[PDB]
Design an enzyme around this catalytic site. Structure first.
Site, PDB file in Angstrom:
ATOM      1  N   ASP A  14      55.354 -14.959   6.915  1.00 50.85           N
ATOM      2  CA  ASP A  14      56.256 -14.414   5.900  1.00 50.85           C
ATOM      3  C   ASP A  14      57.669 -14.987   5.989  1.00 50.85           C
ATOM      4  O   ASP A  14      58.598 -14.420   5.412  1.00 50.85           O
ATOM      5  CB  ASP A  14      56.308 -12.880   5.965  1.00 50.85           C
ATOM      6  CG  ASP A  14      54.972 -12.245   5.688  1.00 50.85           C
ATOM      7  OD1 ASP A  14      54.320 -12.619   4.687  1.00 50.85           O
ATOM      8  OD2 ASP A  14      54.571 -11.358   6.472  1.00 50.85           O
ATOM      9  N   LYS A  66      47.923  -8.697  -2.653  1.00 52.28           N
ATOM     10  CA  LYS A  66      47.780  -7.270  -2.956  1.00 52.28           C
ATOM     11  C   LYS A  66      47.552  -7.033  -4.451  1.00 52.28           C
ATOM     12  O   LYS A  66      48.267  -6.270  -5.117  1.00 52.28           O
ATOM     13  CB  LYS A  66      48.967  -6.493  -2.407  1.00 52.28           C
ATOM     14  CG  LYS A  66      48.977  -6.520  -0.869  1.00 52.28           C
ATOM     15  CD  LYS A  66      50.009  -5.601  -0.282  1.00 52.28           C
ATOM     16  CE  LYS A  66      49.966  -5.639   1.217  1.00 52.28           C
ATOM     17  NZ  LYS A  66      50.148  -7.027   1.722  1.00 52.28           N
ATOM     18  N   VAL A  67      46.549  -7.720  -4.967  1.00 53.82           N
ATOM     19  CA  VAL A  67      46.333  -7.778  -6.399  1.00 53.82           C
ATOM     20  C   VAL A  67      46.153  -6.363  -6.939  1.00 53.82           C
ATOM     21  O   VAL A  67      45.326  -5.591  -6.434  1.00 53.82           O
ATOM     22  CB  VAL A  67      45.102  -8.641  -6.713  1.00 53.82           C
ATOM     23  CG1 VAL A  67      44.933  -8.787  -8.208  1.00 53.82           C
ATOM     24  CG2 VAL A  67      45.241 -10.019  -6.078  1.00 53.82           C
ATOM     25  N   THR A  73      44.098  -9.276 -16.021  1.00 57.06           N
ATOM     26  CA  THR A  73      45.155  -9.969 -15.302  1.00 57.06           C
ATOM     27  C   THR A  73      44.694 -10.272 -13.878  1.00 57.06           C
ATOM     28  O   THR A  73      44.971 -11.352 -13.360  1.00 57.06           O
ATOM     29  CB  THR A  73      46.460  -9.143 -15.301  1.00 57.06           C
ATOM     30  OG1 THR A  73      46.917  -9.021 -16.653  1.00 57.06           O
ATOM     31  CG2 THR A  73      47.555  -9.795 -14.441  1.00 57.06           C
ATOM     32  N   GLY A 181      51.952  -0.996  16.232  1.00 57.54           N
ATOM     33  CA  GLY A 181      50.548  -1.019  16.607  1.00 57.54           C
ATOM     34  C   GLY A 181      50.278  -1.849  17.850  1.00 57.54           C
ATOM     35  O   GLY A 181      50.923  -2.875  18.084  1.00 57.54           O
TER      36      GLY A 181
END
Ligand SMILES: O=c1cc(O)n([C@@H]2O[C@H](COP(=O)(O)O)[C@@H](O)[C@H]2O)c(=O)[nH]1
Ligand SMILES: O=c1cc(O)n([C@@H]2O[C@H](COP(=O)(O)O)[C@@H](O)[C@H]2O)c(=O)[nH]1
Ligand SMILES: [Cl-]
Lengths: 222, 218
Positions: A14, A66-67, A73, A181
């Site tokens: 990222d 994260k569609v 679409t 985590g």
């Protein structure tokens, strides 16, 4: 028959500029063969960044998009993403069965894979997602989804997700490291852990990755 | 926000030449274009600046932002760097994720639109039952711009009730998905229209026809 993720460790890349993203990914290449590329990098550097990663590293690419749109679409997004060379795409389940099915249909046609995100790791996930998550997961199983994403930050929830999807399904889990985590605890339930900042913001990303792997050494496959 | 003819074009064509041509054909009718991932992932984020250079339209980036707060911040920053005036954000991931977007928007002089209920049939499964609460969360967070579904006018009316007359509301699902332009404008400030215009044999005539049908509402 699931993707063979080296060291059960997926890099969440990222970083938002090409030079740093390429440098860090190259530095950890001996430890990780699977990279999750999301919108921070893609919106900063273009979909060709997937091409560049394949050229430079040969790593598997999961497009963390994260569609979360309507079926029509969603179809277009999946088509554009697979056209660019992603091996798999991550899709939200909360928009419902039709939206998920649209993605599955494209993946089937194009010979790629869908991962279904069922619950999320951030505190805000408790507001709306958590209450729907068991049903979202069950819906995924009914739709034939084989790959899932669930949160490292909520071990009891991750355990339940694993139960719903069964032992044969593939499960990957973010929230390890920066969000709190634990790698080993997470791998009790997940096939692979996703790690971003703990690695990519480290002074020595290779040492950070090696250290995580050393801590889970007894959990690796022969 | 002042949207010409209360009509927002959803430009979901996936090639630059067609997207630019069709937008040009309807430019007299609109001044606001919604650009989403179909176009951006096919042609790059540079397409936003190109639309501004060619048309001087406002640009709403329909990116359905739906990640954790840290990632949402990055997505919003990259999006506004590309020249978008506003971004559409899902409410379903919770308040922290929405706040992250509101923060970047304030920093860069932009707007967040909160999507509260979606238009597809599948929205009934999980989103609809949460939608009123998502809208109230928007109100609590100071959100002023919302998105709700043309395909369920009773739900769109409820959303308008929750947010009040002073909030701004835009609504997709008009035309191809079955929503009616005039009925939708009873509740929404502007309608979003994609396929009915961009897949029409004559996009200009299609846009003109929609506007004629709502002329007394302008
Ligand atoms: O529930 C989820 C789902 C995600 O994809 N992610 C993603 O996983 C990554 C987590 O990175 P980090 O290790 O820096 O916290 C980010 O790319 C984030 O967008 C998450 O954190 N929680
Ligand atoms: O609930 C929603 C939210 C949307 O943003 N949209 C978007 O609005 C547009 C609708 O286009 P169309 O008029 O072709 O149905 C698409 O870009 C879609 O992604 C929607 O249809 N329903
Ligand atoms: Cl828990």
């Amino acid at each position: 028959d699931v993707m063979d993720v080296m060291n059960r460790l997926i890099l969440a890349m990222d970083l938002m500029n090409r030079d740093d993203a390429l440098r860090v990914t190259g530095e950890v290449r001996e430890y990780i063969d699977t990279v999750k590329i999301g919108y921070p990098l893609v919106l900063s550097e273009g979909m060709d960044i997937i091409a560049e990663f394949r050229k430079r590293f040969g790593c598997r690419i999961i497009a963390d998009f994260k569609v979360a749109d309507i079926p029509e679409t969603n179809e277009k997004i999946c088509r554009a993403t697979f056209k660019a060379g992603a091996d798999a795409i991550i899709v939200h389940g909360f928009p419902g069965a039709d939206s998920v099915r649209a993605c599955l249909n494209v993946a089937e046609e194009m010979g790629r894979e869908v991962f279904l995100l069922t619950e999320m790791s951030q505190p805000g996930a408790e507001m709306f997602i958590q209450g729907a998550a068991d049903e979202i997961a069950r819906m995924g199983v009914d739709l034939g989804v084989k790959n899932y994403v669930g949160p490292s930050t909520r071990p009891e929830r991750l355990s339940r997700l694993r139960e719903i999807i069964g032992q044969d399904s593939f499960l990957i889990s973010p929230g390890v490291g920066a969000q709190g985590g634990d790698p080993g605890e997470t791998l009790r339930f997940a096939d692979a852990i996703i790690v971003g900042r703990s690695i990519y913001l480290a002074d020595n990303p290779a040492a950070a990755a090696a250290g995580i792997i050393e801590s889970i050494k007894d959990l690796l496959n022969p």
